[PDB]
Each structure stands twice: as structure tokens, then as C-alpha cells.
């Protein structure tokens, strides 16, 4: 199915306290493959996955050169935003940037992203057409007028539609045994007791990849977010993911309830009900 | 591979 490559950059100002923290991570799908951390001693782009270690010195030297360039840019950007918002100099602020591309089943371009946040809020985003910008506020309109006048978008369009797909393709064949797998969710159900009148039913999916999953609870009534509490998908740490979902039920008819699991690993969506 | 050109806000 669809695939994606994403770079995530964070830069954090540490005021009357010195130079900014800069962290960059690259992903192919739900798998990290590179990092750079201004605070590490190495000052190098570093491998984080087995199938990228096979790249040669020139790949590492370029990636290192280019990520240090990004880091100075994000450094100037902290000072510039401080100014757009007349914030004083004693606060710690955050700039985050994301970019990359999705390919479809056939590995041809589907979608591109390039967006920024400041202090946790949307600041500027390239739009799905890759031709114009969405500024969230009038500070972000300054940025926008500056990047239109210097035609940033066209240049980003060539990279997103172009180079970015070529890299994802390259990687999708280097990391074939890792990246082009799917693990189907392993499932099972727990049953407790809320004191003594009603019990919770919890539905578990374990060691699946990639991360997208759907769990819904149904009743021979129908659907109910009657606290179907749903936890964020979480990493097991080995490459796979976990998720759970619980509905609360009257403690004498648990068989009315079914857990449906959908994952691109499952030939057909699983249905689970409580074996008493 | 990351962008080879950078530009400020």
C-alpha cells in the first residue's frame, strides 16, 4: 500500500542560557532511520536503522552538511519570530518543521507536505496543490509575502514531487525485509469487575505494524462511545505497536458486545467476543 | 535525503 517519508525538526531556544537545542529525525513510515542532535558530541547525522548503515561516507557527509545548514536557519528563525511577536528575550520558544512525501501502491507521487509550527500552533503550511501557502496569522503573512516574492513554493514542488520520491523508492528497496513487511495484530480480551454491578471489557491488539489500526466496539444494539475509552497507539519498542479499547457493560451480558479490528495485515477484519 | 537549500522565515 501507500508509503511515506517524513522529516521532523525541532528547535528550542534556551535564553540567557546559550545556544538552541536542535533535533532532527527522519522516518520511512512508522520506522525511524536517522537522527541529528545538536547536543550529542558527534555533530553528525547518525544511522538509526540497520538498512541505512549500508550508505557510504558521501551520503553521510552530505546529510551532515545539509542538516547543519537547517540548524543555523532554524537558529536565525527563533530570533526573527521573537521579533515578529515582540516577545522579550527571557522566554524559551519552540520552532517545529515537518516535510516529506507520500507515494501510492505503485510508488508514484501521491502527496506532499511542508509546514511549520511556533510555540505549538500552526504558523505556515504549503497547501495540497503545492502552489500556495496558508498563513495562520498576520506574522505568518510576512513570511508568506517573502516566500512568494522569492518563489520558494516552486522549488519545494520540484523536491517533493521529485527528489523526495526518488529517495523513498531507494530506501524502500534497501530496507525491503523491514519496510515492506506487515505484522497482523494479535488479539485478546480482558474482563474485570467495577466493584460489583457492572464490568469493563477491554480489547487488545499487539505487535502489529504499521501503526494505523481501527478498534471499535459494537453491540447487537449498535455503536456507542458510552465510554469506549481508546488509548493512543503505542510503540512496543521492538518495531511493533499496541492499542486497546474498553467499553463499560452491565455485569451479566458480555456476549452482546463485539470488538472489530481492522488492519492492513488482516486478510479479513477480526471480530472478537468474550469467551466466558 | 533532506533539502539541499535552506531559507529563512
Amino acid at each position: 500500500g501507500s508509503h511515506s517519508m517524513r522529516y521532523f525538526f525541532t528547535s528550542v531556544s534556551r535564553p540567557g542560557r546559550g545556544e538552541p537545542r536542535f533535533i532532527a529525525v527522519g522516518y520511512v513510515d512508522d520506522t525511524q532511520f536517522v537522527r541529528f542532535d545538536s547536543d550529542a558530541a558527534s555533530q553528525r547525522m547518525e544511522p538509526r536503522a540497520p538498512w541505512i548503515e549500508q550508505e557510504g561516507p558521501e551520503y553521510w557527509d552530505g546529510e551532515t552538511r545539509k542538516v547543519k545548514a537547517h540548524s543555523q536557519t532554524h537558529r536565525v528563525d527563533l530570533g526573527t519570530l521573537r521579533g515578529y511577536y515582540n516577545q522579550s528575550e527571557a522566554g524559551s520558544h519552540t520552532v517545529q518543521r515537518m516535510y516529506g512525501c507520500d507515494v501510492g501502491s505503485d510508488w508514484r507521487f501521491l502527496r506532499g507536505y511542508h509546514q511549520y509550527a511556533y510555540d505549538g500552533k500552526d504558523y505556515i503550511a504549503l497547501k495540497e496543490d503545492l502552489r500556495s501557502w496558508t498563513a495562520a496569522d498576520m506574522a505568518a503573512q510576512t513570511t508568506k509575502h517573502k516566500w512568494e516574492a522569492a518563489h520558494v513554493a516552486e522549488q519545494l514542488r520540484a523536491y517533493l514531487e521529485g527528489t523526495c520520491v526518488e529517495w523513498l523508492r531507494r530506501y524502500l528497496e534497501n530496507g525491503k525485509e523491514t519496510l515492506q513487511r506487515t505484522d497482523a495484530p494479535k488479539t485478546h480480551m480482558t474482563h474485570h469487575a467495577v466493584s460489583d454491578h457492572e464490568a469493563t471489557l477491554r480489547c487488545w491488539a499487539l505487535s502489529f505494524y504499521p501503526a494505523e489500526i481501527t478498534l471499535t466496539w459494537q453491540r447487537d444494539g449498535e455503536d456507542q462511545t458510552q465510554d469506549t475509552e481508546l488509548v493512543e497507539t503505542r510503540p512496543a519498542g521492538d518495531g511493533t505497536f499496541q492499542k486497546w479499547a474498553a467499553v463499560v457493560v452491565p455485569s451479566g451480558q458480555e456476549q452482546r458486545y463485539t470488538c472489530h479490528v481492522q488492519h492492513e495485515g488482516l486478510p479479513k477484519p477480526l471480530t472478537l467476543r468474550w469467551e466466558p | 535525503g533532506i533539502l539541499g537549500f535552506v531559507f529563512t522565515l
Partner: T-cell receptor, first 109, second 111 residues
Framework: QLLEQSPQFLSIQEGENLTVYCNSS?????LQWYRQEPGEGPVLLVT?????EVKKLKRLTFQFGDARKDSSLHITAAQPGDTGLYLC??????????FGKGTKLSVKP | GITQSPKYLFRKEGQNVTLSCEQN?????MYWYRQDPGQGLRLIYY???????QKGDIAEGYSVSREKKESFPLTVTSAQKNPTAFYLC???????????FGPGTRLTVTE
């Protein structure tokens, strides 16, 4: 990334029309023309960005090909003062400009 | 808004020299080139942003620094046996976009 200009040297008579080309294999997201006189810095003429677009400056017409892999520089009724070295450059994917080697134009009276 | 100085310079071979280039155009990116006899431009060094620089096509025997947005000095050391040339500096609002060229400096190194 490469920009080939042609021809290297071009010599015409005052009053004649001319065209000079700048070619590549790869799409360029922006393109620039300059004219340089000896002992001086190149002067920026124009920037083109949209495929198909046409801009005019004095006696000069610049065109960006529809697929954005080519540009041309056309002069109507050339005059001695049009003499000089013409250069195209294009946006470089590593934060520079890609330069072709020039067309040297002489316009004889 | 771009200035290079001086227009003409002369040095004995092996005598290290620094060429200056300042701009008050507010441009993030700066470039150095050399040009020879009826020829074209060759990129020496450039800098997309302050505190960062990277090599061009003919970097060896040259060095640069970029500590202030407005300035981009080029040092000509006992390089390649290369140094007599017309040197041109340029800048651009962001890197890869249109460049504006200073008037250039003519450097001769004699024996």
C-alpha cells in the same frame, strides 16, 4: 544539473533580429538572464518562473519553455549597445545558481 | 547594495590576501566567483545563511568566513598556482534565487 548555452559567439549587423538559447535536461523552478560587459559584474536582466511565460526589457524578449527546461533570449533590431556577454542561470538544488558559459554578442554598425 | 574593495590589488607570490564584500541588501545568501580570459564564472565558495558556508567547484587554496550577515571575506592563500583573476561577489535574498553582483576586484600576483 546543467545549463548549455548556444552559440558561443554571435556577430550580427545593427538592425537585425536575434535569438539565443539556454537548454537543460532537467526542469528548473526559476531562471535568470544577465549581461556582462568586460571588467564589470553581470547585470541582472530578468527572472522567469512560469512555464510558457514571456517578459520584455527594452529590445529584449525572454521566454521560458512550457516544460521549464529551456529559455530563449530574443533581440529585436539590435544596436551596437546590445553588445556584451549573455548568461543564463537556474535555481540549484544545493542553494546556488547553475550557470551556462555564455553567448558573446557583437553588434556591428 | 553590494560593494567590493578595492577595485585593483597586487601582491608578490606567496603573500596571502583577503578580499572584501559587504552588502546592505538584507540578503541571506552570498557567493564568490572567479573569471579568467574571455571566459566564464567559476564558483569558489558560498554561504546560504550566517555561520554556514560550503565549497563551490574551485574551492582549493581559498577560505571564507561568514559571521555577520553583511559580509563575506575571501582569503586567497598560497592556493593552487592560480591566483591572478577577476573576483566577483554576489548575494541573493535566499539561496538559489536571483543574484546581484558586486563590481568585482582585479587581483594580480607577480613573481
Amino acid at each position: 544539473q546543467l545549463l548549455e548555452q548556444s552559440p558561443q559567439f554571435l556577430s550580427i549587423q545593427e538592425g537585425e533580429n536575434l535569438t539565443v538559447y539556454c537548454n537543460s535536461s532537467s526542469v528548473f523552478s526559476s531562471l535568470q538572464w544577465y549581461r556582462q560587459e568586460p571588467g564589470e559584474g553581470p547585470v541582472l536582466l530578468v527572472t522567469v518562473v512560469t512555464g510558457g511565460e514571456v517578459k520584455k526589457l527594452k529590445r529584449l524578449t525572454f521566454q521560458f519553455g512550457d516544460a521549464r527546461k529551456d529559455s530563449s533570449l530574443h533581440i529585436t533590431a539590435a544596436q551596437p549597445g546590445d553588445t556584451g556577454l549573455y548568461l543564463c542561470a537556474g535555481a540549484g538544488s544545493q542553494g546556488n545558481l547553475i550557470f551556462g558559459k555564455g553567448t558573446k554578442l557583437s553588434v556591428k554598425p | 547594495g553590494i560593494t567590493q574593495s578595492p577595485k585593483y590589488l597586487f601582491r608578490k607570490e606567496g603573500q596571502n590576501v583577503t578580499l572584501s564584500c559587504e552588502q546592505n541588501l538584507n540578503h541571506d545568501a552570498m557567493y564568490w566567483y572567479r573569471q579568467d580570459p574571455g571566459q566564464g564564472l567559476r564558483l569558489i565558495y558560498y554561504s546560504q545563511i550566517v555561520n554556514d558556508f560550503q565549497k563551490g567547484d574551485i574551492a582549493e587554496g581559498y577560505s571564507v568566513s561568514r559571521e555577520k550577515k553583511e559580509s563575506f571575506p575571501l582569503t586567497v592563500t598560497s592556493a593552487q598556482k592560480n591566483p591572478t583573476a577577476f573576483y566577483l561577489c554576489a548575494s541573493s535574498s535566499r539561496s538559489s534565487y536571483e543574484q546581484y553582483f558586486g563590481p568585482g576586484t582585479r587581483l594580480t600576483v607577480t613573481e
